[PDB]
Ligand SMILES: *Cc1cc2c(cc1C)nc1c(=O)[nH]c(=O)nc-1n2C[C@H](O)[C@H](O)[C@H](O)COP(=O)(O)OP(=O)(O)OC[C@H]1O[C@@H](n2cnc3c(N)ncnc32)[C@H](O)[C@@H]1O
């Protein structure tokens with residue numbers, strides 16, 4: 069339990085995304101599950117809130133005055149090739165999970181970025197490059213080991229505590245900290261994917277075709293569109309530097325033949341500054357988004373879920389987020405539907421299953437820039453479900469009403485009840501917080 | 510000691526490049542140095558030859574009737590950040606070395622392909638993407654642990670056995686099997702590199718400019734040119750498929766500013782089908798050549814060293830290896846000079862230091878194809894040093910005269926003497942073999 073101004077406090081308290089500028093009263097760099105339970109026990113004695121950080125990818129509330137458990141040293145993974153499952157400790161990032169599953173020819177339902185904490189991602193739902201085919205990562209869990217608000221370790225399956233197994237798979241840490249989880253693995257060894265990086269002048273054309281194209285693709289095709297002003301930086305090749313880029317991401321988990329057939333029409337649009345679409349070992353999946361996770365940064369994230377992508381919706385995005393807009397934020401359009409739209413084998417509380425698309429924005433916190441982001445998301449409200457994707461929400465989305473928007477009204481009702489039952493003092497509240505039901509007080 | 514038709518013989522006997530179709534009398538999958546010494550002791554009892562394989566990247570002679578030591582399980586690496594050195598076990602591939610050195614911001618002098626066995630590469634010399642700046646990997650060794658032909662383990666430094674330290678660093682396994690080595694590490698954290706992938710019609714223009722360009726670059730710029738008929742395969746992006754490609758590889762180990770300045774003129778040539786030149790973590794270095802090492806293959810490798818690349822030399826390469834040639838082999842032109850051309854701090858036997866370029870060919874063994882390869886290398890003999898790069902030699906280069914061409918005449922004289930002294934029965938002869946001096950009998 070490091071305290072402020074002790075050696076390595078800052079090390080253990082600060083994550084990748086610093087937008088929640090937070091100062092925990094103590095930080096425990098847990099080495100194992102016992103240290104996690106001990107940290108939680110301590111906090112319960114001191115009537116203190118408890119938060120958990122594996123990477124700092126997903127900030128929400130300030131950890132001021134809280135105990136923060138840093139799980140980054142708990143990076144254990146083990147694979148059961150026979151049963152096609154992996155055991156993943158609290159702090160294991162997907163890159164490490166992939167190291168272990170690839171030798172067997174197995175893939176988890178990981179996301180766009182290998183740097184991301186597998187557990188935090190999963191308990192938000194977890195929308196990746198196999199998701200349109202298989203669903204949310206939270207829909208494919210065998211069991212959980214959990215530190216509950218009394219500081220007890222508990223093994224949990226759909227069998228032993230339905231309520232808790234349901235709530236944790238989409239509820240983040242609101243019901244306890246996950247020390248390890250057992251996930252189903254899938255026989256995926258290769259992807260046909262990469263990017264079509266179009267010049268700015270093509271943005272309207274591309275987004276219009278994309279809106280149509282997505283209506284015909286199978287569930288094996290995950291795809292998204294990034295719109296970004298790229299700086300003149302050496303970290304990207306010369307065709308992408310210092311200009312507006314519309315980047316179409318492909319991730320087809322079937323045969324390259326099929327993928328290429330689907331993709332080929334998109335090439336008739338242009339000009340294409342760079343084309344990386346290719347057959348790759350699934351291990352290389354993190355090259356499709358190639359998201360920078362080396363330096364810490366501050367970013368204000370916000371997203372809305374779209375019931376549909378229409379011409380007029382496209383035109384708003386072109387106008388407020390395309391080349392001439394001069395928007396100082398990145399915009400990403402991610403395709404959902406498919407398996408995401410169908411109820412999971414084993415129920416969970418993951419919301420937004422009716423969404424066709426996620427529309428995401430990432431912004432340096434600066435008032436002119438945040439205004440334009442606001443204007444863009446407001447102008448899309450008519451094509452919006454009212455929902456937000458929880459894993460793509462940011463530090464501005466911390467109020468109870470903002471968190472409610474991540475769940476269906478019924479799921480949230482039930483979640484409030486379960487929360488009262490498993491976290492009566494609302495100890496896990498350094499998070500996208502589900503408040504205890506008022507009826508349970 | 511697996512024998513033929515025992516479970517896992519084929520596993521342990523066959524490597525990546527199968528061009529030496531070899532059947533060892535026994536294969537020892539050594540777990541540690543003691544098993545290696547025991548294997549060598551056994552062979553010395555039985556008057557049998559001994560070969561060593563970590564990956565099968567570098568075949569030469571058939572292992573028929575030999576004992577083969579497979580070192581692939583000896584993959585240990587440890588790094589001394591303070592002293593900037595790594596300890597590398599026999600079988601460790603560069604990818605694993607890189608895993609350990611990158612967290613400290615250190616780089617070994619590895620080569621184009623992370624799949625390659627660090628030790629085998631180094632004892633051939635070892636020409637990589639930092640070589641023009643720092644020299645051969647064999648020029649930066651602190652010590653070796655070696656199993657000599659009596660089966661004894663021996664720690665060797667420039668201090669304790671000058672003759673042996675000299676000979677092993679360029680002599681491959683001719684003087685004993687290396688169980689571990691201690692290499693100097695360099696403070697390189699990033700490269701500016703990648704490819705300019707030009708269409709076939711530009712090949713003459715590019716090779717002519719390259720010939721000139723290389724005369725002005727600093728030692729921080731490693732570069733090469735691949736000429737290849739790419740099949741219509743899904744493993745490469747659509748611009749590179751089913752056509753002739755001239756691929757210019759850049760690897761600048763200075764500041765991106767400097768790299769870009771150097772590279773920019775090359776873009777004035779064209780058309781460029783794809784441009785990947787960018788600032789990257791040095792860990793990603795294996796993306797510059799992106800050589801396929803997943804499937805085994807058969808390949809007949811041959812190279813000649815060039816004293817200079819002239820217009821007429823270029824025109825022969827264009828004519829016999831460029832788009833209209835219909836050559837069924839790959840051709841690679843690699844730039845040497847720089848630190849390679851200067852004597853190493855601590856002497857070694859690595860030859861070809863006077864070469865400006867390596868010209869390499871890789872061929873499926875088929876007589877029409879091998880004829881054209883022969884014709885190309887013969888037609889370049891006037892611009893040739895007479896030498897060959899040992900690490901780039903193949904199964905056709907196994908005769909004493911072919912191996913002599915890898916060393917200066919004096920070095921080879923001395924090498925024959927040392928060989929008689931350390932391997933009097935020529936036990937290590939499943940290799941590019943240095944025969945014992947006749948004067949020592
Ligand atoms: C940064 C980022 C995030 C990201 C992404 C790409 C990047 C560059 N791509 C995603 C994608 O393709 N699909 C997706 O669904 N999400 C994606 N994300 C977001 C990511 O899922 C979330 O940010 C998630 O929170 C990441 O978890 P991580 O553990 O890495 O992050 P954290 O800040 O350290 O923790 C955030 C919250 O996660 C919950 N959490 C963390 N550990 C636990 C444990 N052990 N038990 C229970 N809950 C846990 C907490 O709520 C914590 O506050």
Ligand SMILES: *Cc1cc2c(cc1C)nc1c(=O)[nH]c(=O)nc-1n2C[C@H](O)[C@H](O)[C@H](O)COP(=O)(O)OP(=O)(O)OC[C@H]1O[C@@H](n2cnc3c(N)ncnc32)[C@H](O)[C@@H]1O
Nearest residue numbers: 562563564565566567620621626629630636681682687900
């Ligand atoms: C396949 C390949 C090779 C390669 C390369 C790229 C690819 C795809 N790029 C290279 C590069 O950029 N620069 C360079 O200098 N060489 C490059 N190579 C060639 C490589 O250096 C050689 O092929 C080398 O022989 C590789 O060694 P490896 O150990 O991987 O290969 P092997 O077939 O299993 O062994 C070949 C011979 O190496 C000597 N050897 C191997 N292990 C030992 C030990 N422990 N002690 C002593 N000698 C050893 C033997 O002579 C063995 O026969």
